Amino acid sequence: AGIAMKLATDREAAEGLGSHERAIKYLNQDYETLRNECLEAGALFQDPSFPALPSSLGFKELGPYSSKTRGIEWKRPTEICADPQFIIGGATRTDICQGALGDSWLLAAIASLTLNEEILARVVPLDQSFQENYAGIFHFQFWQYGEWVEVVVDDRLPTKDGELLFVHSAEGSEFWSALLEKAYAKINGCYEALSGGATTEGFEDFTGGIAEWYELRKPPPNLFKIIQKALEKGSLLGCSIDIGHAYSVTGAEEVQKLIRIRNPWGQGEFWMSFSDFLRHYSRLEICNLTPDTLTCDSYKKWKLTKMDGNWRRGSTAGGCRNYPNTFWMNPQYLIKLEEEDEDDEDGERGCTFLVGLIQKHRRRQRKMGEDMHTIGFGIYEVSKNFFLTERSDTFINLREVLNRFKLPPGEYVLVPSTFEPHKNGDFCIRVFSEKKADYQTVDDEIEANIEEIANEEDIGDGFRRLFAQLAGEDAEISAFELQTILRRVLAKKSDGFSIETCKIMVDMLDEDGSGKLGLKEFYILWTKIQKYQKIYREIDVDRSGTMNSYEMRKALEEAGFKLPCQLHQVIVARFADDELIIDFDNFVRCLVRLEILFKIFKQLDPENTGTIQLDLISWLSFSVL
Amino acid sequence: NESEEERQFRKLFVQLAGDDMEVSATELMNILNKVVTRHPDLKTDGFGIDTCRSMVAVMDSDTTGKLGFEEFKYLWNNIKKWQGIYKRFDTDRSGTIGSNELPGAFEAAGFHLNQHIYSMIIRRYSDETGNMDFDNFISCLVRLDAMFRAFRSLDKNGTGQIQVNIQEWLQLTMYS
């Protein structure tokens, strides 16, 4: 925990940890290890971090003491089938079904998977079985808000009267499907979490793709071309009718307008009018693959970019153009296209792209699609942009919000947010586009420009007597001597610098190396302090004795500093009180450490490499002193 | 499945935050200024807010100003050790440790540096009297702990060195 952790993880991700080739070991569990361990011991696997107990079932509908979970017998594949198989190839259809417990969104998600190898495999390692190095363990790979996470489960599946209570094929022989659902429950905390699920989400987590989705009631014009264009790129589509069986869409050719409709629980597809479509089905869901999903040598893929961000109450949580005091404070991004979508009818000048903003897991989300803020973004045509900032709107409260665009080449700025300001969250924005697009972050570069005041001859003759008559016997003031004095020029706006502050004050300007302030140094302090009161003065437009969090950005700039949004979050989280207020004592204390923390760096970094190198000892000293 | 203690606090958690399970500084300040401020088995007014804000910071990896329960649990556990090391060195039960005991109490605490650093830490957490109240003794150990944990996190391989760009340097030192 703490910052040093996120930083290590961050560095790890930048080395590829969390990419499909190097997925994150969920809970730090590794499949090969634990498997081998169980093999050396001639035991079958028993997962400690999601045992065959109530825990893994539910907390409310599927809770402990709940009758629905009373008298479940967890049993392993060998104990409900003579010959358990992981997966059979040839698969031309599906017969998965749901047990008496267990949401039916899994049907369609799993059904989509069983009709593309390259897909399935991306989430279900094929090298797996009951006949090879079997030890009652399996493993899967899910996509999680932008990165991949490998989850491991022991095979015991839940059953009442020897009937599987969840996802399970009707034949009764192939176990992979039931075992995938077990691991997905796992990374969501328990089966019951999967209760209200959406198929686009879990299908998103089974693929790494992005779901684009249309209430047929109110289709857009140009849909058929969208249908057709997805099928070329390779996207799984899925349609159905609202109360309820899921079908997909496998083709979309003119002759007339006509799209072919498959049903995986059949062995096969069938033609139907696009117009009849519109009329028999009520949803259409499209799921666009990342370009590294299929290895089709020229299948034309999406070009993908993604980035990660945060909102934090007090600094970065602004959002919605409805709130112009703060909207500009959200984190900003620049999307810049070049090759317009190539010609055919359309209309131009069309670089086509998908924008997705997904919201990362919050610590109270016990179940799918619950406690999901309202989120949204703006795009704008052409340093952090100010208040003087092309579709925007459509601010839904789903886990992911998405909008398809086609806009002229050039530069655009994306600003994602929540609808009302002040809500903490993380997010990932991905952009899939026809041609190479570019992404860059736009924010203030880090910059400490502090005016080098001084001291030169003169120095108030009043100054002079003043410090001597204050230093006492040594002609030096301590953080303490200093403490009380300032408390005097102070109470007579504020109730004194705290004692910690005082101390850092002294740390900054000591240099004598002695813990005490000479005459010259106590005049620098004093001028900086006066400088801090000025700045603090103006920001306190409202002349309230206090400053709101949201104003530090600006404050800090007048004090000669420019930071990026994450450093801004760290200041308000560390220097403000609930209610987003920063007292005058905090404020300067902040600004002093920040001056010191930059100094130490440029000095250890005199050639400006952009990085400094420290050994425990030197770390402990600088870092605390 | 956890020390009856932790599962009680937990109440104080669920009361204050619900399913969020997290706690502000000042909220968490209270909770601590209760188990340890009532008891005359130990002299101390209470933990400072500042002291308190730090506990949260070094243990917040999401930069939200909240201390998660799991993290709370790590903190408390060392907090109760460092309780051990406190009393064990506050002979006079003054509500301070006199200067000359600290370096024992510190080495006691698992952290072993030299004279040169203790001649600084002491010189920076003590009072004019050169003695460190409990507040300070704990606050320090909280830091030291986290700057040590920070380095391990940034040296996963073995070099006994870390290299930080500027953003890393200020995240790691401003949130501390």
Tab-separated table of C-alpha atoms in Angstrom, chain A residues 1-8 11-12 15 312 363-364 366 424 426 446 478 480-481 500 503-504 507 563-564 566-567 569-571 573-578 586 589-590 593-594 597-598 600-601 610-617 619-625, chain B residues 19-20 22 24-27 50-51 53-54 57-65 71 113-114 117 120-121 123-128 136 143-144 146-151 153-154 156 159-176:
chain	number	residue	atom	x	y	z
A	1	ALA	CA	0.000	0.000	0.000
A	2	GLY	CA	0.807	3.628	-0.581
A	3	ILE	CA	2.223	5.362	-3.528
A	4	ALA	CA	5.330	3.196	-3.946
A	5	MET	CA	3.182	0.322	-4.750
A	6	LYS	CA	1.194	1.870	-7.648
A	7	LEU	CA	4.559	3.150	-9.005
A	8	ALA	CA	6.080	-0.512	-9.062
A	11	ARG	CA	6.535	0.290	-13.982
A	12	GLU	CA	5.546	-3.378	-14.346
A	15	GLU	CA	7.171	-3.565	-19.140
A	312	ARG	CA	-10.438	12.936	-7.382
A	363	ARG	CA	-14.444	-0.890	-3.518
A	364	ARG	CA	-18.246	-1.238	-3.030
A	366	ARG	CA	-20.468	-6.191	-4.741
A	424	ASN	CA	-13.792	9.707	-7.032
A	426	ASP	CA	-10.653	5.514	-12.128
A	446	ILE	CA	6.229	19.679	-14.079
A	478	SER	CA	15.119	27.674	16.306
A	480	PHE	CA	10.617	26.736	18.283
A	481	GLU	CA	11.747	30.394	18.864
A	500	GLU	CA	5.722	20.613	11.729
A	503	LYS	CA	10.354	22.677	11.158
A	504	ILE	CA	10.196	22.259	7.324
A	507	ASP	CA	14.987	22.385	6.862
A	563	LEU	CA	2.254	19.989	-12.012
A	564	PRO	CA	0.362	17.210	-13.745
A	566	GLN	CA	-1.794	13.127	-10.490
A	567	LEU	CA	0.477	15.399	-8.507
A	569	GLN	CA	-4.426	14.889	-6.680
A	570	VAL	CA	-1.650	14.005	-4.219
A	571	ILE	CA	-1.466	17.623	-2.871
A	573	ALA	CA	-5.449	14.496	-0.704
A	574	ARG	CA	-2.480	15.120	1.537
A	575	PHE	CA	-3.014	18.941	2.307
A	576	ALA	CA	-6.778	19.360	2.550
A	577	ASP	CA	-9.369	18.506	5.009
A	578	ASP	CA	-12.617	16.811	4.392
A	586	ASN	CA	-1.103	23.460	5.163
A	589	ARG	CA	3.763	23.738	4.471
A	590	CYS	CA	2.910	22.215	1.047
A	593	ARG	CA	8.176	20.798	1.022
A	594	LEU	CA	7.493	21.061	-2.702
A	597	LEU	CA	11.688	18.301	-2.815
A	598	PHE	CA	12.533	19.996	-6.213
A	600	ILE	CA	17.069	18.213	-3.725
A	601	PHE	CA	16.371	16.657	-7.096
A	610	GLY	CA	15.402	13.300	-15.612
A	611	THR	CA	16.101	10.875	-12.882
A	612	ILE	CA	18.042	10.552	-9.596
A	613	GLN	CA	19.539	7.351	-8.022
A	614	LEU	CA	19.568	6.637	-4.357
A	615	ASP	CA	20.762	4.000	-2.018
A	616	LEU	CA	18.806	3.051	1.086
A	617	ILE	CA	20.734	5.371	3.233
A	619	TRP	CA	16.965	7.573	0.315
A	620	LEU	CA	16.119	7.481	4.057
A	621	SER	CA	17.863	10.642	4.715
A	622	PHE	CA	16.496	12.790	1.756
A	623	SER	CA	13.126	11.223	1.940
A	624	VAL	CA	12.724	12.102	5.552
A	625	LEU	CA	14.897	15.216	5.994
B	19	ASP	CA	-19.340	-1.185	2.070
B	20	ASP	CA	-16.692	1.401	1.009
B	22	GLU	CA	-12.411	3.113	4.234
B	24	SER	CA	-10.888	9.509	6.473
B	25	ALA	CA	-7.910	10.875	8.497
B	26	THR	CA	-9.772	12.757	11.051
B	27	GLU	CA	-12.286	9.808	11.387
B	50	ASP	CA	-0.954	15.463	10.949
B	51	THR	CA	0.290	12.308	12.428
B	53	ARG	CA	-2.963	12.114	7.772
B	54	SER	CA	0.388	10.421	7.363
B	57	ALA	CA	-1.031	8.624	2.903
B	58	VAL	CA	1.648	5.915	3.226
B	59	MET	CA	-0.888	3.470	3.091
B	60	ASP	CA	-3.143	4.923	0.344
B	61	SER	CA	-2.163	3.748	-3.145
B	62	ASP	CA	-5.110	5.232	-4.716
B	63	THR	CA	-4.480	8.971	-3.692
B	64	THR	CA	-8.005	9.329	-2.292
B	65	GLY	CA	-7.178	10.402	1.269
B	71	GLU	CA	-4.382	-1.548	5.284
B	113	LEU	CA	20.718	3.250	10.860
B	114	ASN	CA	23.659	5.053	12.264
B	117	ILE	CA	20.679	9.620	11.108
B	120	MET	CA	18.705	13.954	12.828
B	121	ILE	CA	15.594	12.078	13.315
B	123	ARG	CA	16.765	16.352	16.186
B	124	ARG	CA	13.586	16.569	14.050
B	125	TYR	CA	10.931	14.656	15.927
B	126	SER	CA	11.814	15.620	19.576
B	127	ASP	CA	10.753	18.782	21.494
B	128	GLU	CA	13.040	21.679	22.602
B	136	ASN	CA	6.111	11.671	17.425
B	143	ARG	CA	7.483	7.030	7.954
B	144	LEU	CA	10.437	5.224	8.347
B	146	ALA	CA	6.921	3.409	4.602
B	147	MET	CA	10.167	4.778	3.207
B	148	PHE	CA	11.662	1.507	3.721
B	149	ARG	CA	8.793	-0.282	2.166
B	150	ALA	CA	8.906	2.176	-0.720
B	151	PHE	CA	12.511	1.285	-1.549
B	153	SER	CA	8.978	-1.871	-3.854
B	154	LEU	CA	11.325	-0.002	-6.254
B	156	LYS	CA	12.418	-5.830	-6.565
B	159	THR	CA	20.560	-3.753	-6.418
B	160	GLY	CA	20.643	-1.810	-3.213
B	161	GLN	CA	19.482	1.327	-5.374
B	162	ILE	CA	16.439	2.923	-6.965
B	163	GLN	CA	16.150	5.394	-9.739
B	164	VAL	CA	13.171	7.806	-9.893
B	165	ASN	CA	12.199	10.281	-12.470
B	166	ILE	CA	10.739	13.564	-11.047
B	167	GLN	CA	7.105	12.514	-10.896
B	168	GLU	CA	8.035	9.430	-9.027
B	169	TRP	CA	10.167	11.532	-6.590
B	170	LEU	CA	7.375	13.886	-5.696
B	171	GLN	CA	4.597	11.242	-5.460
B	172	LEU	CA	6.736	9.255	-3.186
B	173	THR	CA	7.768	12.353	-0.999
B	174	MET	CA	4.780	14.646	-1.121
B	175	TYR	CA	2.301	11.725	-0.129
B	176	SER	CA	4.274	10.689	3.014
